[PDB]
Amino acid sequence: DTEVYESPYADPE
């Protein structure tokens, strides 16, 4: 939605 996640960008790819 507009303000609620958990795991963003961790690896290259």
Partner 1 sequence: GSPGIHESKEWYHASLTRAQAEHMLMRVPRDGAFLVRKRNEPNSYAISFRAEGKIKHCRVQQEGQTVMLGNSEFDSLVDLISYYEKHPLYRKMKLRYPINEENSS
- State the nearest-atom distance from the C-beta of 1 to partner 1, in Å: 8
- State the nearest-atom distance from the C-beta of 12 to partner 1, in Å: 4
What whole-number distance in Å separates Cα of residue 13 and Cα of residue 1?
A: 24
What is the Cα Rg of the chain in Å? 10
Q: How many residues of this chain interact with partner 1, rule: CB under 8 A?
A: 12
**Per-residue binding letters, 1-13, with partner 1 (x by CB under 8 A):** -xxxxxxxxxxxx
What whole-number distance in Å separates Cα of residue 6 and Cα of residue 11?
A: 15
Instruction: By CB under 8 A, name the binding residues for partner 1.
Output: 2-13
